[PDB]
Design a protein around this ligand. Structure first.
Ligand SMILES: c1cc(CNc2cc3c(cn2)[nH]c2ccccc23)cc(Oc2ccc3c(c2)OCO3)c1
Ligand SMILES: Nc1nc2c(ncn2[C@@H]2O[C@H](COP(=O)(O)OP(=O)(O)O)[C@@H](O)[C@H]2O)c(=O)[nH]1
Ligand SMILES: [Mg+2]
Lengths: 59, 427
């Protein structure tokens, strides 16, 4: 009976742990995916600043 | 000399209730527990199985055990339900799932101490307890797993008391689930150690009997249990009725069991009769003797001619010539003495009781300790191995804490038992 308790507990335990790192790894990846997208759009902003800026350096 | 009776599980409680129904009638006890018989012979040993209560009412010394409530609810609303002491209904709720592990290790373990409290309470009210008897199957989970746990714990608390069982051995012809060989093999190991007499009821012999002899095309468990309760009444007749000589369970066991592990008996009954179908012609002593010795009348599906009898007991009931009985019994042995071991002299014994059972003027009950019973254990071992070599359906058991090793162990012990029988078949 002790072995059965230990085995129901380890299964509950490893399932809790396997799920928790999955949800963390998914949190990390999705954030590192949206941030990369934003940062391409912000490099986009500087570039457009350099285009408006270069044009003023033209008169 | 009181006996304490225990019935465990679906099968154990259904046959067990029939036993109390049948003998309660034989002793003139009505479903209320009130005596309404004619003779005093049917009350002289009534203490063996019934406790006497206030109001001159008789209460079976019976404990009813299950891990699910369905079958025991059906017992109380049943033909003789009211007679049982209500404190002796001991039951859980989760069931055993036809799983020996659940009955023996997890679900049964939770419940067993409560059962033993009732056993102890019934025992301490016994002037001289002479043993216990259990009814149960080996194919399910409660009667098989928890029944053998009870037997282990009873032997711990009462190590010198006789323990006998009626054990319904599973068979694929009449079968509920595929794991029955697993549960039976695990149970048999326990029975080999902790019982003095085990009457092996093979559920397919009961089937073949109901079909081929009583001409019942679709027999139910109820038809099967009519045959069993006829045998249960027969083999306990000489304890329940004053007669030729009275032996307590120990003395009976001493003279039937030459080797401690070979205590698995082949029961039989003559005449074989179906419910309702009225028998009008009484049998002659020669007819009873031929039939009770005939393979077709045996309830363990084993050919007695494939082995040798170590001991035999026969219980005739009704008015008949004990001289004619002696001559007919001596005629069977002297005509087939090659199926009896020559090294246990005078190993066939007989008793007669004047009280016949309900519906028959005359009957005979057969108790055979034959080495042919090994065929029953060979069948279980083959079915066990067919699944076990692939570890099939074991997850049901490993999930309750069991290791493969306990199965290997159970398999090896039963193969030892088979080989032990073979030693004495060739001696
Ligand atoms: C008590 C006694 C017996 C009979 N045992 C016996 C008889 C004789 C013998 C050796 N042993 N040698 C003999 C020579 C001549 C005549 C008779 C005998 C069997 C028994 O088993 C059960 C188990 C569960 C039950 C049950 C009965 O009824 C309901 O549930 C219990
Ligand atoms: N003779 C007979 N056998 C039964 C009955 N019910 C179940 N069985 C047998 O017992 C096995 C199942 O065990 P079960 O009774 O469920 O054990 P439990 O879990 O202790 O109730 C099967 O192999 C059946 O053949 C019955 O009413 N009569
Ligand atoms: Mg069942």
């Amino acid at each position: 009976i002790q072995k059965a308790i230990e085995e129901n507990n380890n299964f509950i335990k490893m399932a809790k742990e396997k799920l928790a790192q999955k949800m963390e790894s998914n949190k990390e990846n999705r954030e590192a995916h949206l941030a990369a997208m934003l940062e391409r759009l912000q490099e986009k902003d500087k570039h457009a600043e350099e285009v408006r800026k270069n044009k003023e350096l033209k008169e | 000399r009181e006996i304490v009776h225990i019935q465990a599980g679906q099968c154990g409680n259904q046959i067990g209730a029939k036993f109390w129904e049948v003998i309660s009638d034989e002793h003139g006890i009505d479903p209320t527990g009130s005596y309404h018989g004619d003779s005093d012979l049917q009350l002289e040993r009534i203490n063996v199985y019934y406790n006497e209560a206030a109001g001159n009412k008789y209460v079976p010394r019976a404990i009813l055990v299950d891990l699910e409530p369905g079958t025991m609810d059906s017992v109380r609303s049943g033909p003789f339900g009211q007679i049982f002491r209500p404190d002796n209904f001991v039951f859980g709720q989760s069931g055993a799932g036809n799983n020996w592990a659940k009955g023996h290790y997890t679900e049964g373990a939770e419940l067993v101490d409560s059962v033993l409290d009732v056993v102890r309470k019934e025992s301490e009210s016994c002037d001289c307890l002479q043993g216990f008897q259990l009814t149960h199957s080996l194919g399910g989970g409660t009667g098989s797993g928890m029944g053998t746990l009870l037997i282990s714990k009873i032997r711990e608390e009462y190590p010198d008391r006789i323990m006998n069982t009626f054990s319904v051995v599973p068979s694929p012809k009449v079968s509920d689930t595929v794991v029955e060989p697993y549960n039976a093999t695990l149970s048999v190991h326990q029975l080999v150690e902790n019982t003095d007499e085990t009457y092996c009821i093979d559920n397919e012999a009961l089937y073949d009997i109901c079909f081929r002899t009583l001409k019942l095309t679709t027999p139910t468990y109820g038809d099967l249990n009519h045959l069993v309760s006829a045998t249960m009444s027969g083999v306990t007749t000489c304890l329940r009725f004053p007669g030729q000589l009275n032996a307590d369970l120990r003395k009976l066991a001493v003279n039937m069991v030459p080797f401690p592990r070979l205590h698995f008996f082949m029961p039989g009954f003559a005449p074989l009769t179906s419910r309702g179908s009225q028998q009008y012609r009484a049998l002659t002593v020669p007819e009873l003797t031929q039939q009770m010795f005939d393979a077709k009348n045996m309830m363990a599906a084993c050919d007695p001619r494939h082995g040798r009898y170590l001991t035999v007991a026969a219980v005739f009931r009704g008015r008949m010539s004990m001289k004619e009985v002696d001559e007919q019994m001596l005629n069977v042995q002297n005509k087939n003495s090659s199926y009896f071991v020559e090294w246990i002299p005078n190993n066939v014994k007989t008793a007669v009781c004047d009280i016949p059972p309900r519906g028959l003027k005359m009957s005979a009950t057969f108790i055979g300790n034959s080495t042919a019973i090994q065929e029953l254990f060979k069948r279980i071992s083959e079915q066990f191995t067919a699944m076990f070599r692939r570890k099939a359906f074991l997850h049901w058991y490993t999930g309750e804490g069991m290791d493969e090793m306990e199965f290997t162990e159970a398999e090896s012990n039963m193969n030892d038992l088979v080989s032990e029988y073979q030693q004495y078949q060739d001696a």
